[PDB]
Design an enzyme around this catalytic site. Structure first.
Site, short mmCIF file in Angstrom:
data_model
loop_
_atom_site.label_atom_id
_atom_site.label_comp_id
_atom_site.label_asym_id
_atom_site.label_seq_id
_atom_site.Cartn_x
_atom_site.Cartn_y
_atom_site.Cartn_z
N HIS A 14 4.21 -5.61 3.19
CA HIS A 14 3.67 -6.04 4.61
C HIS A 14 4.29 -7.54 4.79
O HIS A 14 4.64 -8.35 4.08
CB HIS A 14 2.29 -6.00 4.91
CG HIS A 14 1.79 -4.62 4.88
ND1 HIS A 14 1.67 -4.06 6.26
CD2 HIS A 14 1.59 -3.39 4.17
CE1 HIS A 14 1.38 -2.96 6.31
NE2 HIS A 14 1.31 -2.50 5.13
N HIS A 52 -9.21 2.41 -0.28
CA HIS A 52 -8.49 3.54 -0.07
C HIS A 52 -7.50 3.79 -1.31
O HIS A 52 -7.39 2.97 -2.05
CB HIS A 52 -7.40 3.30 1.03
CG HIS A 52 -8.17 2.92 2.37
ND1 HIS A 52 -7.25 1.96 3.47
CD2 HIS A 52 -9.06 3.31 3.06
CE1 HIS A 52 -8.12 1.93 4.31
NE2 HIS A 52 -9.23 2.69 4.37
N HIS A 57 -11.13 0.13 3.83
CA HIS A 57 -10.14 -0.63 2.93
C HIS A 57 -10.73 -1.65 2.06
O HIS A 57 -11.74 -2.30 2.46
CB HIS A 57 -9.21 -1.35 3.88
CG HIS A 57 -8.03 -2.18 3.36
ND1 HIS A 57 -6.95 -1.58 2.95
CD2 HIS A 57 -8.15 -3.50 3.34
CE1 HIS A 57 -6.05 -2.74 2.51
NE2 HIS A 57 -6.94 -3.64 2.66
N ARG A 62 4.98 -4.20 8.86
CA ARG A 62 5.65 -3.43 7.68
C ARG A 62 7.03 -3.68 7.64
O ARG A 62 7.87 -3.14 8.45
CB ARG A 62 5.66 -1.83 7.96
CG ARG A 62 4.18 -1.34 8.33
CD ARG A 62 3.73 0.16 8.72
NE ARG A 62 2.51 0.36 9.08
CZ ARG A 62 1.83 1.56 9.14
NH1 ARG A 62 2.89 2.77 8.76
NH2 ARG A 62 0.80 1.75 9.50
N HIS A 120 0.90 4.71 2.03
CA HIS A 120 0.63 5.03 3.19
C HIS A 120 0.50 6.60 3.30
O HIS A 120 1.26 7.36 2.48
CB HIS A 120 1.44 4.54 4.49
CG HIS A 120 0.94 2.95 5.12
ND1 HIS A 120 0.65 2.56 6.10
CD2 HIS A 120 1.18 2.10 4.04
CE1 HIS A 120 0.40 1.16 6.05
NE2 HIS A 120 0.65 0.94 4.97
N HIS A 166 0.78 -1.28 -0.04
CA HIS A 166 -0.01 -0.03 0.09
C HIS A 166 0.74 1.37 -0.02
O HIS A 166 2.00 1.29 0.27
CB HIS A 166 -1.03 0.19 1.20
CG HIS A 166 -1.52 -1.47 1.63
ND1 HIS A 166 -0.90 -1.78 2.73
CD2 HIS A 166 -2.28 -2.24 1.05
CE1 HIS A 166 -1.55 -3.06 2.99
NE2 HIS A 166 -2.18 -3.41 1.93
N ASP A 223 -4.57 1.52 -1.65
CA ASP A 223 -4.87 0.13 -1.69
C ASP A 223 -4.19 -0.47 -2.91
O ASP A 223 -5.20 -0.66 -4.06
CB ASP A 223 -6.11 -0.16 -1.33
CG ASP A 223 -6.46 0.30 -0.07
OD1 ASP A 223 -5.76 0.42 0.90
OD2 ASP A 223 -7.85 0.16 0.43
N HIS A 234 -2.99 4.00 5.65
CA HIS A 234 -2.97 3.95 4.24
C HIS A 234 -3.54 5.25 3.79
O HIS A 234 -4.52 5.87 4.43
CB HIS A 234 -4.24 2.77 3.93
CG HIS A 234 -3.72 1.28 4.24
ND1 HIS A 234 -4.68 0.22 3.72
CD2 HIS A 234 -2.71 0.88 4.88
CE1 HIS A 234 -4.06 -0.89 4.45
NE2 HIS A 234 -2.94 -0.56 4.88
CU LIG Z 1 0.53 -0.85 4.08
ZN LIG Z 2 -6.31 0.26 2.84
#
Ligand SMILES: [Cu+]
Ligand SMILES: [Zn+2]
Ligand SMILES: [Cu+]
Ligand SMILES: [Zn+2]
Lengths: 153, 153
Positions: free
Chosen positions: A120, A80, A71, A143, A48, A46, A83, A63
């Protein structure tokens, strides 16, 4: 055309370079590169909100979500902006990333330049996990590596 | 206000964190933080054109220069947008950075978000050195640490 780049690093072995290119401001962003040092299988991926690495990947915040939606996966209307779903690492721990996305952008209100790209620990459940956390993070866990997205030549 | 942050890192001991804040989009940007690991004395300090760290600080490219001017000090009319002069490290190798600048901006079509901040080996001669390189880099020498300028909360 606009181009961007991100060097992914973290506390562990995950390291990568991810490239971004957008031919037109009203058109899709191509996202490609290679990330190594991953466990085999799926890993949440993602953008952020903050390009802040002062406390490692934790300071990147949530995010990137300027439309205040829940999400989802990249295919969902309800997602998001940040995403991008999952990337897949092969048995050697390398994810050959190749994504095209029409919701992120390299300019305007959906601009991701100056924000943080994160890869992730676990798969992103794409909002389908049946808990509150699924609607926020996709239950993607920690993360592993991140980087600020910069303008590229 | 708009806020940005930069984590400076390199191949040696130089590291630091630099904050940016701009109360008004048409107002000055305050730049403050600290850098450790530097030789006592002046060190060139600039925004470079690309937020690209793929080959370390080398891939940041030249000073950010959207108006196509010659290299200057921050107070000069003739300067690159990225020209923030020198920071000063003390006898312990620590530079307390405190700058206000009205040429750089955190927004608008010439913003510094997603570009690279660089701290240098040598003093910036403010373009007064009398060789060609003075008019490009201020003869500030090698890039000791750098980071992409990201959006902060
Ligand atoms: Cu993320
Ligand atoms: Zn998200
Ligand atoms: Cu520089
Ligand atoms: Zn310059």
């Amino acid at each position: 055309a606009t181009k961007a780049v991100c060097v992914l690093k973290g506390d562990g072995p995950v390291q990568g370079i991810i490239n971004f290119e957008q031919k037109e401001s009203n058109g899709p962003v191509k996202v490609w590169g290679s990330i190594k040092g991953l466990t085999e299988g799926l890993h949440g991926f993602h953008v952020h909100e903050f390009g802040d690495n002062t406390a490692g990947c934790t300071s990147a915040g949530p995010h990137f979500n300027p439309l205040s939606r829940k999400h989802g996966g990249p295919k969902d209307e309800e997602r998001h902006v940040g995403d991008l779903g999952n990337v897949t690492a092969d048995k050697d721990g390398v994810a050959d990333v190749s994504i095209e996305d029409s919701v992120i952008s390299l300019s305007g209100d959906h601009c991701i330049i100056g924000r943080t790209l994160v890869v992730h620990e676990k798969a992103d459940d794409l909002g389908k996990g049946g808990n509150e956390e699924s609607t926020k993070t996709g239950n993607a866990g920690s993360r592993l590596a991140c980087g600020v997205i910069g303008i590229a030549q």
